[PDB]
Amino acid sequence: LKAWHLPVAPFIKEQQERLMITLWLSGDDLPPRVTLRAEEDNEELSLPMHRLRQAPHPGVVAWRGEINLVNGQPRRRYSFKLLWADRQLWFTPQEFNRFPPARLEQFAVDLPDSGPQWVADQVFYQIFPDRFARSQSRTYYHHAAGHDIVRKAWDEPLTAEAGGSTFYGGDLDGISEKLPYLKQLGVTALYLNPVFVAPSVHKYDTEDYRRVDPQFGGDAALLRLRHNTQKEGMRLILDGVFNHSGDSHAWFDRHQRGSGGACHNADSPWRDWYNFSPEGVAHDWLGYASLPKLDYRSSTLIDEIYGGEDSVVRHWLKAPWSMDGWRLDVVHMLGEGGGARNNLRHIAGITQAAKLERPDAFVFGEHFGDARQWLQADVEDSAMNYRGFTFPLWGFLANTDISYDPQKIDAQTCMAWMDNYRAGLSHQQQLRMFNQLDSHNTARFKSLLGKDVARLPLAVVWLFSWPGVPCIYYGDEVGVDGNNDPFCRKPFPWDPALQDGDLLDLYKRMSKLRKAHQALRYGGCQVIYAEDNVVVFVRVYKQQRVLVAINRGEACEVVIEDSPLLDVNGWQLKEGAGALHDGVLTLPAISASVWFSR
Amino acid sequence: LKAWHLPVAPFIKEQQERLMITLWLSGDDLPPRVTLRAEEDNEELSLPMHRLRQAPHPGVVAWRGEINLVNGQPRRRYSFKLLWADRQLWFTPQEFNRFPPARLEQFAVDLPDSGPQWVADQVFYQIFPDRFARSQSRTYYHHAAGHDIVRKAWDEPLTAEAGGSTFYGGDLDGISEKLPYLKQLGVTALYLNPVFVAPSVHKYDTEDYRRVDPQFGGDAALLRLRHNTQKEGMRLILDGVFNHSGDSHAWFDRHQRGSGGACHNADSPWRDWYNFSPEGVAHDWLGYASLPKLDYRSSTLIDEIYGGEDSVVRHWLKAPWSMDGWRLDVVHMLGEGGGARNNLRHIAGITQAAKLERPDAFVFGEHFGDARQWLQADVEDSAMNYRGFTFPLWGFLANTDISYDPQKIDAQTCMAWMDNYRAGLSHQQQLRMFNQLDSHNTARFKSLLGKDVARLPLAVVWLFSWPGVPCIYYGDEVGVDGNNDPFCRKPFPWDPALQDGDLLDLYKRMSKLRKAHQALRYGGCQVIYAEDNVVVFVRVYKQQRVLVAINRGEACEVVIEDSPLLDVNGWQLKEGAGALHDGVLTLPAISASVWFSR
Ligand SMILES: C[C@H]1O[C@H](O[C@H]2[C@H](O)[C@@H](O)[C@@H](O[C@@H]3[C@H](O)[C@@H](O)[C@H](O)O[C@@H]3CO)O[C@@H]2CO)[C@H](O)[C@@H](O)[C@H]1N[C@H]1C=C(CO)[C@@H](O)[C@H](O)[C@H]1O
Ligand SMILES: C[C@H]1O[C@H](O[C@H]2[C@H](O)[C@@H](O)[C@@H](O[C@@H]3[C@H](O)[C@@H](O)[C@H](O)O[C@@H]3CO)O[C@@H]2CO)[C@H](O)[C@@H](O)[C@H]1N[C@H]1C=C(CO)[C@@H](O)[C@H](O)[C@H]1O
């Protein structure tokens, strides 16, 4: 028995406050009844389906049912219950199920969708500002480090020494001046690491949430960037560091720059914004003395960060700043009493305050772990998709993982992993998952591949074609490598002699295909083949199809069975050297290929 | 490769604010390292494990690690990461995993446990008061029904006519007078259907939340029951109906008994406690005109139901009532604006208010569906376990399901279903899941079995030995049958000529074994065999073991491989006619057996 359904047209259609749902079946012993099992205000309903008279494709039977949109919550969850006289079988995002699927692992469509619809149209670029570009027209003591900061010329090797204290002097005007490069790359949106006043180079040790650090050009340079990006039709996301402050923040003031710091004054207005021993000594947070954790048990703190009208979260989302969203640093540990108590409520409060100021604000969190409980409760829009995208590819392609432990997973396991994760997410959620290969917090993926660096182009193609929004970590596109923090923060090589121009061109081309084809931005996704070295999946949107074939190993041929999803007029190869003929994929060694239908 | 771990002693031990975690492995190609992957304030940690010098059982290698209890949230989640030079493998509640388990499907132990610890020690009994017992010393118009209520003598057949309007006259003093019967049955706790003033016989159409209905004996009879149960060491749970009110409630007052009813007065104090059209006509709730839904958007309603000190939820939990908890009717749909919007927050508010009045209050909800999102967010203590217990047995034993659709599932599928569901729950949560075979809302299980009614004793034994608290639906124990509502609410047969005394005796014996053996109340649970007709599982607690074998089909023999969990001095058969000798289970047809170790 075979079945097909994706939570997108041609399988679903909205008409006059009804959501029409279509299922495809094929086989010799087809069920004489099918029930659409759909939820309405968390109650399970058994909606009848009826057999369509016309076969949508050869050998396929279509069943159709209807979800009433006038009642119920925006997220429409459903699965299919196949019924014979003596038995039943469920059809789900994870193929067939003999017992009922988890309620939170059904197909799901958000209708009406109140999420940030612009995200699916973006190509993001992540910039660590000190290391990207110095503007054309262009030392103090770091108390938490115990020594003055260090200045380095752009071509000086990056070392393990003075990791959080070494500045190459990149700034926000440098970004503005490189907008033509980024535009040519096909970037439409920027995610910046922290820019607010802070003593370190990474600035996760925030000293002032209301002022841009002068080292990066201060307030005027961020305003210029907001103007220049808007002018070029680009989105701009700031790093929101609300789990903790820096220990030079005036609220805390460990090195006693002034008065009323919480660290040394029991009567400080911010004393209950932090955690102290019974004797009144400030607790460190996880060995990090420089990053004291904020205590969201305090109502006055909640008001400062997100609760009030001029809270921090809302401040940078209104004029004159008008930023497009927040990436939430340490989204999973923020909470009360020194740990994650009530974490979900505080993340939801942040997101709600952001959307109050700016309805289409994009709020997404740094989740190295499993983000599904956060996303299934709608406390944020999206997550940095380490568990659903990054680590599956680190395993399948680079034989390693979050802990840099060895991994040996084949194609079957990789795609079971990736499909299981997104089964927990609505289609609209899947399309805005923040996908990337590495970050300021990981070793460079090019490094992790080691002897198999020839696989790097496969990951780039995958980055732009899996459901979700792709994010390029600055320098990835010209071949920058290096180990984990501090060595993943190399200065960008603007000398073309030091750039991998062939890799740059592949990024450019992939962004071109994504902008050109609706299925790469809105489409459903069906894995058609996954065995050993080869993954084949199709993106599906209305009548259009995008086929992707990835082969991590030696040259091979793969027979692709007849699928009603592949029943098109014909295929046009757009990228890669693969070839498709009469159901046979001829795949060169270490290759990825992309076809468009018709 | 083989592995063993249960989230209970002998596998875990608390010592000086550390939780020691032990894993058992066996095989020819054992991993040279194992990492305890444990979460602390939602951050994933890689805690090293070390090989113990002594083999706990023959051919078994033990690895040990430590979770620090001084930091982190009460729920301690963990899994095991087996490591070879080139590869890894995860060990989870659902056996081995090739890619990381879901964060919410790991092993989990609540330490410190602030849940209701008395629940695991209980045997519950559910009473529908009109139909249980009439007290020794012993008609109006039902507006929502359109006709006067009906009186029936105890021996008159139950019919489909006047379903919610027919009274056999059972009352709360009748319950008091049958406490000796219930005590002999081994009942320690009562769950009552609604008792507050209401026109119908089931009383889910609440008219006054502050008064016991006089038909059941009014306030004085409930007080006598609270006294008599307390005297006999029994717990008492009331039905909390907070999703909706009755349409004769004074807040709503459809039939205009007085003034200021919301239904007909736009200026009523309760107008925004319900949903009206733009023209001011009261919306029905799901076809039910008699059950208008409460709008928790209203702050004044929140205060009435749970927010204030003398809210309804807290009112019956303090003196003089001092009830032990609430069963929450329609827990999944309660919310704002006419649907389930913000359902999770309002259920959490109810539970919090209950525990504020009474720290060990037990609050659990009626979940016909998948309750895991509710339980994984701790918004209630437990759920009526239809998805994790009831419907798996309806499938495996009675070939049917929630929708009375045909089911054909074998033992493998049944136990995959039951084990997958509880993998989402901590051990402490698993032990208080509210397990039963049928209710006032389902057909009687004895009926559902049809031609296979000889399987009924298997379900009873299972009811008392699966993790969770068992609940007997009144009359189940003497063989009462019948179809779904109204026919599942038969008057209890106190004539012994009409009772199945052999079935009654089995219930009595099973409650005796549960009270006698710690593993049936606190123990972990490991499925040892599940194939076709036969399920074999072991409850495990410290050095004690309870083995259970269930055979739904013909007589057979099953070979039970050597397990370090079964390595005991010997086994004593306590119930059933099964026999265990040199690893061979001889199982009679349609049988369940229970052994105690040593
Ligand atoms: C002192 C450090 O501050 C920064 O790191 C913070 C920051 O809030 C965030 O990057 C956080 O990162 C991750 C996740 O929260 C975790 O889920 C995941 O398991 O681990 C990630 C990285 O740990 O980590 C810090 C808060 O926990 C800054 O980015 C760092 O560079 C740190 N600065 C120092 C630190 C060292 C040695 O620890 C130096 O080598 C480094 O070069 C400096 O920049
Ligand atoms: C009018 C009815 O009131 C009661 O039923 C309510 C009640 O709040 C609760 O029992 C609820 O039950 C279940 C769950 O909430 C659902 O998750 C699940 O899918 O379905 C369950 C049962 O529907 O159902 C009602 C609120 O939805 C009372 O128990 C019932 O007996 C009803 N009273 C009438 C109804 C009919 C025909 O509908 C008569 O045959 C019956 O004998 C009467 O008592």
CSV table of C-alpha atoms in Angstrom, one decimal, chain A residues 258-547:
chain,number,residue,atom,x,y,z
A,258,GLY,CA,29.7,54.2,40.1
A,259,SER,CA,27.1,53.9,42.8
A,260,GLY,CA,24.1,51.7,43.4
A,261,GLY,CA,25.5,48.7,41.6
A,262,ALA,CA,23.8,45.5,42.8
A,263,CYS,CA,27.1,43.6,43.2
A,264,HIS,CA,28.3,45.7,46.1
A,265,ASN,CA,25.1,47.5,47.4
A,266,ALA,CA,22.5,45.5,49.2
A,267,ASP,CA,20.1,48.5,48.8
A,268,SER,CA,20.6,48.7,45.0
A,269,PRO,CA,17.4,49.1,43.0
A,270,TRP,CA,18.5,46.0,41.0
A,271,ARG,CA,19.5,43.8,44.0
A,272,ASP,CA,16.7,41.3,43.2
A,273,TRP,CA,17.6,41.3,39.5
A,274,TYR,CA,20.5,39.0,40.4
A,275,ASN,CA,21.3,36.1,42.7
A,276,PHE,CA,23.3,36.4,45.9
A,277,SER,CA,24.3,34.1,48.8
A,278,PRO,CA,22.7,34.5,52.2
A,279,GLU,CA,25.7,36.7,53.1
A,280,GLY,CA,25.2,39.0,50.1
A,281,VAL,CA,27.9,37.9,47.7
A,282,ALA,CA,27.1,37.7,44.0
A,283,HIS,CA,26.8,34.2,42.6
A,284,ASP,CA,28.6,33.5,39.4
A,285,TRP,CA,26.7,32.0,36.5
A,286,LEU,CA,28.1,28.6,35.3
A,287,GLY,CA,31.7,29.6,35.9
A,288,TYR,CA,31.1,32.8,34.0
A,289,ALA,CA,31.8,35.6,36.5
A,290,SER,CA,31.5,38.2,33.7
A,291,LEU,CA,27.9,37.1,32.8
A,292,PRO,CA,25.7,37.4,35.8
A,293,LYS,CA,22.3,35.9,35.3
A,294,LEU,CA,19.1,38.0,35.4
A,295,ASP,CA,16.4,37.0,37.8
A,296,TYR,CA,13.0,37.2,36.1
A,297,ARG,CA,11.3,36.7,39.4
A,298,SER,CA,11.5,40.5,39.7
A,299,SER,CA,8.5,42.3,38.3
A,300,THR,CA,10.7,45.5,37.8
A,301,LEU,CA,13.1,43.5,35.7
A,302,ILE,CA,10.3,42.0,33.6
A,303,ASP,CA,9.1,45.6,32.9
A,304,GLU,CA,12.6,46.7,31.9
A,305,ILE,CA,13.3,43.9,29.5
A,306,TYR,CA,9.9,43.3,27.8
A,307,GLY,CA,7.0,44.3,30.0
A,308,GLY,CA,6.8,48.1,29.6
A,309,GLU,CA,6.3,50.3,26.5
A,310,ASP,CA,9.9,51.4,26.5
A,311,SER,CA,11.3,48.0,27.5
A,312,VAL,CA,14.6,46.9,25.8
A,313,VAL,CA,12.9,44.4,23.5
A,314,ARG,CA,10.5,47.0,22.2
A,315,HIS,CA,12.9,49.9,22.2
A,316,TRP,CA,15.0,48.7,19.2
A,317,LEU,CA,11.8,47.7,17.2
A,318,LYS,CA,10.4,51.2,17.0
A,319,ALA,CA,11.5,54.3,15.3
A,320,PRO,CA,14.2,55.4,14.8
A,321,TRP,CA,15.7,51.9,15.1
A,322,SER,CA,12.9,49.9,13.4
A,323,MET,CA,14.8,46.6,13.6
A,324,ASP,CA,13.0,43.6,12.1
A,325,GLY,CA,13.4,41.2,15.0
A,326,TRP,CA,15.6,39.6,17.7
A,327,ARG,CA,17.7,36.5,17.8
A,328,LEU,CA,17.5,35.4,21.4
A,329,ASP,CA,20.8,34.4,23.0
A,330,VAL,CA,20.6,31.5,25.5
A,331,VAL,CA,16.8,31.3,24.9
A,332,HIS,CA,16.5,28.0,26.7
A,333,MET,CA,18.0,28.9,30.1
A,334,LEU,CA,16.5,32.4,30.7
A,335,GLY,CA,14.3,32.3,33.8
A,336,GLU,CA,13.8,32.8,37.5
A,337,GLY,CA,15.8,32.1,40.7
A,338,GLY,CA,19.1,31.5,38.9
A,339,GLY,CA,17.9,28.8,36.5
A,340,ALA,CA,15.2,28.1,33.8
A,341,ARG,CA,12.2,28.2,36.1
A,342,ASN,CA,9.2,29.6,34.1
A,343,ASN,CA,11.4,29.9,31.0
A,344,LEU,CA,8.6,29.3,28.6
A,345,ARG,CA,6.5,32.1,30.1
A,346,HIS,CA,9.3,34.6,29.9
A,347,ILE,CA,10.2,33.7,26.3
A,348,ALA,CA,6.5,34.1,25.4
A,349,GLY,CA,6.4,37.5,27.1
A,350,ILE,CA,9.4,38.6,25.0
A,351,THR,CA,7.9,37.5,21.8
A,352,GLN,CA,4.5,39.0,22.6
A,353,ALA,CA,6.1,42.4,23.5
A,354,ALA,CA,8.1,42.4,20.2
A,355,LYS,CA,4.9,41.7,18.1
A,356,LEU,CA,3.0,44.4,20.1
A,357,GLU,CA,5.6,46.9,18.9
A,358,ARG,CA,6.0,45.5,15.4
A,359,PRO,CA,3.4,42.9,14.2
A,360,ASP,CA,5.7,41.2,11.7
A,361,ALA,CA,8.7,41.1,14.1
A,362,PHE,CA,10.7,37.9,13.7
A,363,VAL,CA,11.8,36.4,17.1
A,364,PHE,CA,13.8,33.2,17.0
A,365,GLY,CA,16.1,31.5,19.6
A,366,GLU,CA,19.5,29.9,19.8
A,367,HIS,CA,18.6,26.2,20.4
A,368,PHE,CA,21.6,23.9,20.3
A,369,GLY,CA,19.2,21.3,21.8
A,370,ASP,CA,15.7,20.1,21.0
A,371,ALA,CA,13.5,23.2,20.5
A,372,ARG,CA,10.1,21.4,19.9
A,373,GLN,CA,8.5,22.2,23.3
A,374,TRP,CA,9.2,25.9,22.7
A,375,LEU,CA,7.9,25.9,19.1
A,376,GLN,CA,4.9,23.7,19.8
A,377,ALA,CA,3.8,26.2,22.5
A,378,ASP,CA,4.4,29.2,20.0
A,379,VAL,CA,6.7,31.0,22.5
A,380,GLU,CA,8.9,32.1,19.6
A,381,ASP,CA,8.6,32.1,15.8
A,382,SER,CA,11.5,29.8,15.0
A,383,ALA,CA,14.8,28.4,16.2
A,384,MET,CA,18.3,28.2,15.0
A,385,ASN,CA,17.9,24.7,13.7
A,386,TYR,CA,20.8,22.8,15.1
A,387,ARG,CA,18.8,19.7,15.9
A,388,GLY,CA,16.7,19.5,12.8
A,389,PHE,CA,19.3,20.5,10.2
A,390,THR,CA,22.8,21.3,11.3
A,391,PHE,CA,23.7,18.3,13.4
A,392,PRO,CA,22.1,15.8,11.0
A,393,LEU,CA,24.4,17.1,8.2
A,394,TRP,CA,27.4,17.1,10.6
A,395,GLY,CA,26.7,13.5,11.2
A,396,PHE,CA,25.9,12.3,7.6
A,397,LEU,CA,28.5,14.5,5.9
A,398,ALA,CA,31.3,15.2,8.5
A,399,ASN,CA,31.0,12.1,10.8
A,400,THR,CA,30.7,14.3,14.0
A,401,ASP,CA,28.3,16.0,16.2
A,402,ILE,CA,27.5,18.8,18.8
A,403,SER,CA,30.1,17.3,21.1
A,404,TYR,CA,32.6,16.6,18.4
A,405,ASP,CA,32.1,12.8,19.2
A,406,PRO,CA,32.3,10.4,16.2
A,407,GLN,CA,29.2,9.8,14.2
A,408,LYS,CA,28.5,7.0,11.6
A,409,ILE,CA,25.0,7.6,10.2
A,410,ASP,CA,23.8,6.6,6.7
A,411,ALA,CA,21.2,8.3,4.6
A,412,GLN,CA,18.2,6.3,6.1
A,413,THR,CA,19.2,7.5,9.6
A,414,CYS,CA,19.9,11.1,8.5
A,415,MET,CA,16.5,11.5,6.9
A,416,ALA,CA,14.6,9.7,9.7
A,417,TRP,CA,16.3,12.2,12.0
A,418,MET,CA,15.4,15.3,9.9
A,419,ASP,CA,11.9,14.2,9.1
A,420,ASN,CA,11.1,13.2,12.7
A,421,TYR,CA,12.1,16.7,13.9
A,422,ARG,CA,10.0,18.6,11.5
A,423,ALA,CA,7.0,16.4,12.0
A,424,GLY,CA,6.6,18.3,15.2
A,425,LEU,CA,6.2,21.6,13.3
A,426,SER,CA,3.5,23.1,11.1
A,427,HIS,CA,4.3,23.7,7.5
A,428,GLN,CA,4.5,27.4,8.2
A,429,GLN,CA,6.9,26.8,11.1
A,430,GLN,CA,9.0,24.5,8.9
A,431,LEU,CA,9.4,27.2,6.2
A,432,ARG,CA,11.0,29.7,8.7
A,433,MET,CA,13.3,27.4,10.6
A,434,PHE,CA,16.7,29.2,10.8
A,435,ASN,CA,19.0,26.8,9.0
A,436,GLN,CA,22.8,27.1,8.9
A,437,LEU,CA,25.9,24.9,8.8
A,438,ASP,CA,28.0,26.6,11.5
A,439,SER,CA,28.1,29.8,13.6
A,440,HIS,CA,30.1,32.0,15.9
A,441,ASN,CA,29.6,29.1,18.5
A,442,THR,CA,30.8,26.1,16.5
A,443,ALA,CA,33.8,25.0,14.5
A,444,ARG,CA,33.6,25.9,10.8
A,445,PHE,CA,31.9,23.2,8.9
A,446,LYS,CA,34.7,23.3,6.2
A,447,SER,CA,37.1,22.3,9.0
A,448,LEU,CA,34.8,19.7,10.5
A,449,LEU,CA,34.8,17.8,7.2
A,450,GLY,CA,38.5,17.2,7.4
A,451,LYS,CA,39.6,14.8,4.7
A,452,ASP,CA,36.1,14.9,3.2
A,453,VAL,CA,36.1,18.7,2.5
A,454,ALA,CA,35.1,17.8,-1.1
A,455,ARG,CA,31.6,17.3,0.4
A,456,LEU,CA,31.3,21.0,1.2
A,457,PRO,CA,29.3,21.9,-2.0
A,458,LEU,CA,26.7,19.2,-1.1
A,459,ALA,CA,25.9,21.0,2.2
A,460,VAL,CA,25.6,24.4,0.5
A,461,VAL,CA,23.0,23.0,-2.0
A,462,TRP,CA,21.2,21.3,0.9
A,463,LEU,CA,21.3,24.5,2.9
A,464,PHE,CA,19.3,26.3,0.2
A,465,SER,CA,16.8,23.5,-0.6
A,466,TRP,CA,15.7,22.0,2.8
A,467,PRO,CA,12.6,23.5,4.2
A,468,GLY,CA,13.6,26.6,6.2
A,469,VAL,CA,15.4,29.9,5.7
A,470,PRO,CA,19.2,29.5,5.0
A,471,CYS,CA,21.8,31.6,6.9
A,472,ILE,CA,25.3,32.1,5.7
A,473,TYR,CA,27.9,32.5,8.5
A,474,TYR,CA,30.2,35.3,7.3
A,475,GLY,CA,33.1,34.0,5.3
A,476,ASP,CA,31.6,30.5,4.7
A,477,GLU,CA,31.0,31.5,1.1
A,478,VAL,CA,34.6,32.2,0.3
A,479,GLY,CA,36.0,29.2,2.1
A,480,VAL,CA,36.9,30.4,5.6
A,481,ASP,CA,37.7,27.5,7.9
A,482,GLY,CA,38.9,27.0,11.5
A,483,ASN,CA,38.2,25.3,14.8
A,484,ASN,CA,35.7,26.3,17.4
A,485,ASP,CA,35.6,29.7,19.3
A,486,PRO,CA,38.0,31.5,19.2
A,487,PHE,CA,39.2,30.2,15.9
A,488,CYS,CA,35.8,30.2,14.1
A,489,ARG,CA,35.9,34.1,14.1
A,490,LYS,CA,38.6,34.7,11.6
A,491,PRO,CA,38.8,38.1,9.8
A,492,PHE,CA,37.0,38.0,6.5
A,493,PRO,CA,39.5,37.6,3.6
A,494,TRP,CA,38.8,40.4,1.2
A,495,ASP,CA,41.9,39.5,-0.9
A,496,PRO,CA,40.5,37.4,-3.8
A,497,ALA,CA,43.8,35.4,-3.9
A,498,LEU,CA,42.7,34.0,-0.5
A,499,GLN,CA,39.0,33.3,-1.5
A,500,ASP,CA,37.5,30.2,-3.0
A,501,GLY,CA,35.8,31.8,-5.9
A,502,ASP,CA,34.2,28.6,-7.1
A,503,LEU,CA,32.5,28.2,-3.7
A,504,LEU,CA,31.4,31.8,-3.8
A,505,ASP,CA,29.8,31.3,-7.2
A,506,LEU,CA,27.8,28.2,-6.0
A,507,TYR,CA,26.3,30.2,-3.1
A,508,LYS,CA,25.4,32.9,-5.6
A,509,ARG,CA,23.7,30.4,-8.0
A,510,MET,CA,21.8,28.7,-5.2
A,511,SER,CA,20.4,32.0,-3.9
A,512,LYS,CA,19.3,32.6,-7.5
A,513,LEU,CA,17.4,29.3,-7.8
A,514,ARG,CA,15.7,29.9,-4.4
A,515,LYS,CA,14.5,33.4,-5.5
A,516,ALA,CA,13.4,32.0,-8.8
A,517,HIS,CA,11.3,29.0,-7.7
A,518,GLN,CA,8.3,29.2,-5.3
A,519,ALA,CA,8.8,25.5,-4.2
A,520,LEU,CA,12.2,26.4,-2.6
A,521,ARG,CA,10.5,29.0,-0.4
A,522,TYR,CA,6.9,27.7,0.2
A,523,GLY,CA,6.9,24.1,-0.9
A,524,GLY,CA,6.3,20.9,0.9
A,525,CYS,CA,9.1,18.4,1.1
A,526,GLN,CA,9.0,14.6,0.5
A,527,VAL,CA,12.1,12.3,0.9
A,528,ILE,CA,11.8,10.0,-2.2
A,529,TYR,CA,15.0,8.0,-1.5
A,530,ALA,CA,17.4,7.6,1.3
A,531,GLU,CA,19.8,4.7,1.4
A,532,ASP,CA,23.5,4.6,2.4
A,533,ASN,CA,25.2,7.5,0.6
A,534,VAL,CA,22.2,8.9,-1.4
A,535,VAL,CA,19.4,11.3,-0.4
A,536,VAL,CA,16.7,12.2,-3.0
A,537,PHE,CA,13.9,14.7,-2.0
A,538,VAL,CA,11.4,16.8,-3.9
A,539,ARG,CA,10.0,20.2,-3.0
A,540,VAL,CA,6.4,20.5,-4.0
A,541,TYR,CA,4.3,23.6,-4.5
A,542,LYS,CA,1.1,23.8,-6.7
A,543,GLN,CA,2.1,22.3,-10.1
A,544,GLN,CA,5.9,22.9,-9.6
A,545,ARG,CA,8.5,20.5,-8.4
A,546,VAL,CA,12.1,20.8,-7.4
A,547,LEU,CA,14.1,17.6,-7.3
